[PDB]
Design an enzyme around this catalytic site. Sequence first.
Site, short mmCIF file in Angstrom:
data_model
loop_
_atom_site.label_atom_id
_atom_site.label_comp_id
_atom_site.label_asym_id
_atom_site.label_seq_id
_atom_site.Cartn_x
_atom_site.Cartn_y
_atom_site.Cartn_z
N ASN A 32 -4.02 -8.95 4.31
CA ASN A 32 -3.97 -7.51 4.74
C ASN A 32 -4.00 -6.64 3.76
O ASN A 32 -4.91 -5.65 3.46
CB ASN A 32 -2.85 -7.55 5.52
CG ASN A 32 -2.89 -5.93 6.25
OD1 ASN A 32 -3.92 -5.35 6.13
ND2 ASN A 32 -1.68 -5.44 6.38
N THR A 86 0.84 -1.21 -0.05
CA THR A 86 0.02 -0.01 0.00
C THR A 86 0.87 1.44 0.04
O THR A 86 1.84 1.30 0.59
CB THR A 86 -0.89 0.06 1.32
OG1 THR A 86 -1.32 -1.40 1.53
CG2 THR A 86 -2.23 0.70 0.97
N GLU A 91 10.19 -6.60 -2.05
CA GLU A 91 10.79 -5.59 -2.85
C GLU A 91 12.12 -5.51 -3.34
O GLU A 91 12.40 -4.89 -4.21
CB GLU A 91 10.26 -4.16 -2.33
CG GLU A 91 8.84 -3.76 -2.57
CD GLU A 91 7.99 -3.75 -1.66
OE1 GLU A 91 8.32 -4.28 -0.66
OE2 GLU A 91 6.53 -3.69 -1.77
N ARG A 120 4.98 7.42 1.06
CA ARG A 120 4.18 6.78 2.28
C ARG A 120 5.43 7.10 3.30
O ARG A 120 6.44 6.84 3.39
CB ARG A 120 4.03 5.28 1.80
CG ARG A 120 3.66 4.50 3.01
CD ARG A 120 3.17 3.04 2.72
NE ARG A 120 2.92 2.02 3.73
CZ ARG A 120 3.84 1.21 4.23
NH1 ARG A 120 4.94 1.19 3.85
NH2 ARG A 120 3.35 0.59 5.23
C1 LIG Z 1 8.92 -4.88 2.84
C2 LIG Z 1 7.29 -4.90 3.04
N1 LIG Z 1 6.60 -5.17 1.71
C3 LIG Z 1 5.39 -5.05 1.70
C4 LIG Z 1 4.50 -4.53 2.71
C5 LIG Z 1 3.21 -4.25 2.55
N2 LIG Z 1 2.37 -5.36 3.47
C6 LIG Z 1 1.90 -5.29 4.65
S1 LIG Z 1 1.13 -6.83 5.28
C7 LIG Z 1 1.48 -7.35 3.65
C8 LIG Z 1 0.83 -8.96 3.51
C9 LIG Z 1 0.72 -9.54 4.80
O1 LIG Z 1 0.63 -10.99 4.15
P1 LIG Z 1 0.54 -12.31 5.35
O2 LIG Z 1 1.54 -12.66 6.10
O3 LIG Z 1 -0.12 -13.55 4.51
O4 LIG Z 1 -0.51 -11.72 6.10
P2 LIG Z 1 -2.41 -11.97 6.22
O5 LIG Z 1 -2.47 -12.34 5.12
O6 LIG Z 1 -2.69 -12.87 7.48
O7 LIG Z 1 -2.67 -10.39 6.58
C10 LIG Z 1 2.03 -6.55 2.83
C11 LIG Z 1 2.42 -7.19 1.43
C12 LIG Z 1 5.45 -4.46 4.07
N3 LIG Z 1 4.76 -3.89 5.18
N4 LIG Z 1 6.61 -4.58 3.83
#
Ligand SMILES: Cc1ncc(C[n+]2csc(CCOP(=O)(O)OP(=O)(O)O)c2C)c(N)n1
EC number: 1.2.7.1
Lengths: 246, 1177, 47, 182, 62
Positions: free
Chosen positions: B963, B30, B63, B113
């Site tokens: 999320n 996001t 990333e 962000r």
């Molecule tokens: C380095 C980084 N890339 C992307 C994000 C954005 N981000 C936050 S939560 C998430 C996905 C969480 O995945 P998961 O462990 O499966 O959690 P759940 O589906 O239970 O929310 C992402 C991509 C981040 N915080 N840090």
Amino acid sequence: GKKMMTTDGNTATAHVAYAMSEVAAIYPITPSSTMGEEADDWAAQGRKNIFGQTLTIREMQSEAGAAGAVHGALAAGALTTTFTASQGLLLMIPNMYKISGELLPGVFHVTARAIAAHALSIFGDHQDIYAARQTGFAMLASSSVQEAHDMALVAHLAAIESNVPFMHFFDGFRTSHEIQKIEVLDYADMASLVNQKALAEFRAKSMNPEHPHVRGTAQNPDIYFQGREAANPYYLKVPGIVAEYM
Amino acid sequence: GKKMMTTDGNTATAHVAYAMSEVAAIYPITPSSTMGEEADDWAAQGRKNIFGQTLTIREMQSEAGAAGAVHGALAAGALTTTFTASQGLLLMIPNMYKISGELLPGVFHVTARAIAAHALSIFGDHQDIYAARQTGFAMLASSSVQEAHDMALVAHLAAIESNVPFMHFFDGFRTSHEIQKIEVLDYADMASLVNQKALAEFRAKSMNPEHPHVRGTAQNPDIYFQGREAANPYYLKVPGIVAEYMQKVASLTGRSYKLFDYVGAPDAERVIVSMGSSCETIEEVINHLAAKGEKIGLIKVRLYRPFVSEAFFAALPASAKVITVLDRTKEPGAPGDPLYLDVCSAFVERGEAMPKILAGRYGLGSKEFSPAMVKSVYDNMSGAKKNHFTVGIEDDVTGTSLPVDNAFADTTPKGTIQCQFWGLGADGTVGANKQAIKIIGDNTDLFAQGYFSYDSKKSGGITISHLRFGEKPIQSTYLVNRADYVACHNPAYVGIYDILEGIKDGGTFVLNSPWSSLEDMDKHLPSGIKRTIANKKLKFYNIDAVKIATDVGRINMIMQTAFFKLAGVLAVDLLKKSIHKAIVKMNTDAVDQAVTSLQEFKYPDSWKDANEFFKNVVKPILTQQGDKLPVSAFEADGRFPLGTSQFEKRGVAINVPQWVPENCIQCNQCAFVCPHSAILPVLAKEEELNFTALEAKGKELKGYKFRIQINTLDCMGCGNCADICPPKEKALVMQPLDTQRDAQVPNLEYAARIPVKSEVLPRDSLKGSQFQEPLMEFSGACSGCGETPYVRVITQLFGERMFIANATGCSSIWGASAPSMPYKTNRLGQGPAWGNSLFEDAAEYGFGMNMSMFARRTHLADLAAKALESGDVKEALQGWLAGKNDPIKSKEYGDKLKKLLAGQKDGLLGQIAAMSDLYTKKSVWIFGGDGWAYDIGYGGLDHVLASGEDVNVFVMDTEVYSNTGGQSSKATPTGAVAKFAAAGKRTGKKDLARMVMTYGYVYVATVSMGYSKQQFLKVLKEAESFPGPSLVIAYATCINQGLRKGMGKSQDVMNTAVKSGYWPLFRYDPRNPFQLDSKAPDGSVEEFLMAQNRFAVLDRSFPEDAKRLRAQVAHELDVRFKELEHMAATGSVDFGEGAEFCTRDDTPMMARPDSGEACDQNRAGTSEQQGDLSKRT
Amino acid sequence: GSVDFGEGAEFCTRDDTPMMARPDSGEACDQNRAGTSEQQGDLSKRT
Amino acid sequence: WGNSLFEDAAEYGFGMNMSMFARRTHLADLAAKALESGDVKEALQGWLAGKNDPIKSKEYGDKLKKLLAGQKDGLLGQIAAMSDLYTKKSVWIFGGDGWAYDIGYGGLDHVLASGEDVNVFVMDTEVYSNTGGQSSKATPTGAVAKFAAAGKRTGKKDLARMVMTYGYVYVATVSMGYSKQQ
Amino acid sequence: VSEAFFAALPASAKVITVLDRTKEPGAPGDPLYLDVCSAFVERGEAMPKILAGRYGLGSKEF
Ligand SMILES: Cc1ncc(C[n+]2csc(CCOP(=O)(O)OP(=O)(O)O)c2C)c(N)n1
Ligand SMILES: Cc1ncc(C[n+]2csc(CCOP(=O)(O)OP(=O)(O)O)c2C)c(N)n1
Ligand code: SF4
Ligand code: SF4
Ligand code: SF4
Ligand SMILES: [Ca+2]
Ligand SMILES: [Mg+2]
Ligand SMILES: [Mg+2]
């Protein structure tokens, strides 16, 4: 407690960092691998820090892992240090943001090494240290081997007292590996320099189920600005701390 | 080729990036996930770039992986772009160094962000973009949606021509998501702008075996400096390229840009220098003040890097005497923020007269930057000048805040209509407003801006929408605060929030309310709202749209009709035709009945005559009024206290369950199952006690009354409990809230004071575990979330001595979204020690916790061993020292020591008493989802889980990035539809459990609560009991899985997932170490898959693909369980001392003070061959 | 081909948090707050 | 040959794979547009059918490079422009035990679970050979290294058996001193 | 800390070179040069000549 030994910057810095720390998470990277290797050497032999314990040294899968482990050890209330060089520092920056954001008193000892731009390089320049100005660490620099010893000591003391993490950097392959005859302090002498009140306070505010708190929240446009601007006093106080400890 | 479309910044940027690229590697973050998602959407549909091919989009594990893949695609000769935000950009920087070092022409589109410092944040500021100045990218900035389109085009063209990679950034959640009507160029028009010679050259110099070269060498002090300094010409040429391409694009679109633009009085003395979306708002403010003779202006920065002082000074008026450089970043201890330093350096290098230069912070974390703040900045310049200020917040910890007057009149240009729509989540208000903006944009010559404020609460959250419709272009880049037309879509809010804080004089207020009468409005409308409506002479229209919708057999259409007839922007024909384009008869009947129903309410004239932490901070934050909270209210390190959700009291469920005491079998499964902990099993004594209680059964429950209290206000209405209730005549029946709250709120208020009986029954057992206080209560999770019950049970077993390392995901969004903290402290006050570090490093954070605890408790052991040399203290210390590895014995003797050593503050005894929080052994836990355990934090998890230290990791495997919009994971199984799997995912689930089980010193066990609750409990107990690494993966359900019967079937779905063999259960115990707790597959996998909307959609799209994928899923789970059954049936010294040969080179990478002793280098042959050579000669 | 796992489902596959916002999103849908579909049918029948 | 970083060699090679895939698909689309002299048509059809085979692609790429010499106009000029994309390319990922085992492990796992035609060769020296020989996860039980001065207590990181759990990845372990034919 | 910096700096100094061991492509100056320039801008007094130079990149000899 001054005793003369003939060593390079890695040994001079690792001496003081071993005295002043209890936890160290380290990833190998030239020219900083020597400090971690000799710290693990002394831990295996049984050398004691200022608190009379062998320093707990662990090795991570990466320098991101080293910075994360440093964050966990600082949050749980242990005095933590790590050793870094260029690619390591680049991988460490995003966690350094968290470490300075929570006002956790860590000390990173960075050996200045080039950032790979047109070619990988292991030798010295300040590109990595300049890449980390924004993180909110305090940054201390040492010109020689003797100054590396003195400034590592100052960094640990001021990190304990100021609740602001410190980066200590000396030039890589110009101070890290240049043998010189320097006087170091006995661990008993550097132990008396610690601010015991600040050390007890640091252990008190740390993450612990007996007195639990939520750290690492997610905030919205409404209150993030204030949580950012509420950490100014500690930074207004750190330079006077550094001067007094000098 | 200009065509008008109404879109936000993500769409505008992704349009141009799709045109100008052929390869894109993207990680979701996001607010940048939209650009990648719609690029993958267009690729799946078949949209063509300027070269006539579909853009190749791939998703990386991180990333860092996205930046590395971008590097590989640029090196191999493909035009590459990626989309980034803050944490992504931080992970991207080290590869950006390589990309600019090799002069590879990539374009990154970054949405600004915040960087997580004291708290994670998804909203906008320039911290991430400023963190990447040094990388050597060129950095371009866009103020609005139209500028985002234009600047993305300029960035791609100049990247192609200049061989310098570009970063294009626009503000996050201020341009990324603000709908606006903009003209875009046809792909044919932007195709002709490419420099074909440079494109052919770029493809020629790329990595290819036909013309090979070595890239990425290792250099020594001798030649590195020259290889660094040999890339200067390309950077000396890039700014002229950017200027020329600005000219070439302006010829096409007609909007002219420069590297630095000036807006305002040419003879101006007070000039703001800004970057980003604020440049729009300031401009608007200027257009107000300039009509009053104000000599003020603004410099907008477009090209940040490389910074060109020629352009900057060409923009800067020479009459300017005072400059403020506004920055959306904080650098602790820096002499100034980066843009301030750049402007200061420009003025130092010029050497001419140096005006006053001021620095100010604004808009951190997408904090508002309104016209009043711009006015205050100009006033600060005008007199009593202040350097290094913050504008927007009330600073009281360092006095760095400007005073802001919030009476600034309407600066938005005349001719505009401002609308505020307050709504309840998923009632369709934002969808209706997007439809309204699209309809008005496609059918009229009006510019339509629309912004959507949301809420941290997933279910029942408020959603505010601000809409502007103007004859002149809309530059107002801030939330509406003086609205032409307010519309409340939920009368519940009329008391909870201030709906008329943004009204204007005579502003039409349209309220949804069942009580459509004079007297009932007198009874329900709070006195403040009534006094407002009467005083400022409003047009109050009340309509009960729910009755209208129920008559015509969703209040979306009535509300949209109210807007289209009462906003004044136009309508009736347009909305009718739009409904026709999208059953139909019902919608048009609702439209017409709403048309008739709207009438002005003749309000009474007398209407014009009519813990402590929670009360101070949390209640104001929840009511969306924490903008008034000063900086003194917030902890410097950003910590928050526990137990804040307890006082929320948000009754948002429509249906809440009712306990029928007669049918209850007292099984404690409805409590074990509930996701928001609204079920309290109250076990009391007869002397302790509408509050109908039973007689508790069993020997342990002998003299106890039993009761199941329903938390009616803290219920989400998911129906998991009632659907799991055993008796065929349900002991729990879902009933309307209004008919069950009045008699159940006092019951719970009374029941909250009954002591919890935690020693009658073991905590390992189901009923006994539910007889213990839950330390994670009232999350912000989605109604029926499959993650919260697991963590609640874990805290019910271990919450007293627990460290939580929470990865980033849903776990952290509901586990801590300010100001609401579900975690709470027990009666003794020993709650869970919860912390979130990052997405990729939760595992290393928890491991570091483990190391810190290990070190401090060893120090305690050494102190105690020194104190062994009164007898009772000696016995206590020996007993603790022997049994410090057992939580029970350590707790007992820690209590003994804390009794004996009270007030002991001297000597070894004082030291030992000092750290009384290290007595009982602690349980560090790592909580994260499928993304963390599977994709990004995977390496840290693997290392901490192969190290051998006593850490326990619990995986909430939702099979998706729940999320972030539900993007594909590696847990996402075969044949699943997600984001970046629009045709059905072709790679299988990431066998994380079987990966970890290869170690053999790690406890691994898979659990599902809907299937069996006893296996989950046994697994938790023997996982925390294992002296080593332990990994537990829990099947969890998410609303993204699209359960077609609902989230109430979660447990049932969970149950089915294990019956069909999709999600087996098993335990690997190193202490036959493997064992299967789950039965063979039932063959009902097709029913289970069809039960979930992802497979249902996959079928609705491509049936043959769907059936082949489901066949492969069934076959692969059959053979995976076949493998499970196949394997279930049955001191210091250096390695270089005393060796004949050298174990070290002579390279600097292998130099140590000990090294350097003469040794044989394997250059004269082997030892045997040396002996032979010596013998022969 | 392209299709989203949220189209044509009786229940919402998206929250209302900003982390889950898209231009397509925002259509009115049932939030699992009035109970399951079967339990909703039972409540409708009894009343 | 190219070196990106320690942790991202795998993503670098995967990006190479994507770039080659995109450019050769663009070439395929150009050739399909050029199908509409007869010898050039036969060469183009033969390459298009067998572009996935390195041998046939090499043969018909040589044919095309003979036929389209100096062709700098139209679809034919465009097709002759990218003569370096004719024969199918083999992207390889070379790294040691540290990369495959410790730091670049996540990127390797992702690129090696994506399903795209990439090949990774592990030079498992069981140690961080380059940097002073520090402990790895390939460093086996009871081995003395740096940060294992008393003998490493955790076993070798079962990287092959980890990857083999996917089932769509070719996994094979080799030793040259043992047998050269395998 | 500009207080310490100016306490060190002699007031008779007329020309200053700020040596930096870094390269930032396209930056107006290397970070230490920018810090010293900001210190002199914020002081507001006489501004000596400030020069920036690169040296010793990749442990190049100085
Ligand atoms: C380095 C980084 N890339 C992307 C994000 C954005 N981000 C936050 S939560 C998430 C996905 C969480 O995945 P998961 O462990 O499966 O959690 P759940 O589906 O239970 O929310 C992402 C991509 C981040 N915080 N840090
Ligand atoms: C992020 C990062 N951390 C550390 C280093 C330093 N480094 C270079 S090579 C190497 C070890 C290489 O290990 P491995 O893959 O086993 O290689 P080999 O033993 O064959 O040299 C390390 C730690 C680096 N380049 N980047
Ligand atoms: S699930 Fe039903 S039977 Fe079991 S304790 Fe709850 S109300 Fe009673
Ligand atoms: S399980 Fe669902 S319906 Fe039952 S009390 Fe909990 S939130 Fe309400
Ligand atoms: S995991 Fe799924 S159901 Fe649970 S809170 Fe997150 S999005 Fe909602
Ligand atoms: Ca364990
Ligand atoms: Mg998930
Ligand atoms: Mg190796």
